[PDB]
RNA sequence: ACGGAAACCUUGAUUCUAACGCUACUUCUAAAUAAGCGUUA
């Protein structure tokens, strides 16, 4: 889901193959990661809006 | 110069012996130190 929401959207150079069960751990991994982002989504990005 | 005089309601005695302010009870329950990089060049 995450790859045919975000990564999908970029060159296929930038994203990394799974050689085991995916997961993304700790700070600079971005928001997607760290949220619902099927429901965050409009939300997450309009409370940036204005910054 | 009195039915009056003399005469301790007195002596010895522990309000004492025994007895747990005790029995049971998680300072416990969810929670990534994490998100955003625009615009100009």
Redesign the pocket.
């Given at each position: 889901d995450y790859k045919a929401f975000f990564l999908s959207e970029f060159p296929d150079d930038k994203i990394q193959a799974n050689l085991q069960y995916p997961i993304?751990?700790?700070?600079?991994?971005?928001?997607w990661?760290?949220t619902l982002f099927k429901q965050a989504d409009g939300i997450?990005q309009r409370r940036?809006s204005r910054?």
């Amino acid at each position: 889901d995450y790859k045919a929401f975000f990564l999908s959207e970029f060159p296929d150079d930038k994203i990394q193959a799974n050689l085991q069960y995916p997961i993304y751990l700790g700070a600079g991994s971005g928001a997607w990661t760290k949220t619902l982002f099927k429901q965050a989504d409009g939300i997450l990005q309009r409370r940036y809006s204005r910054m």
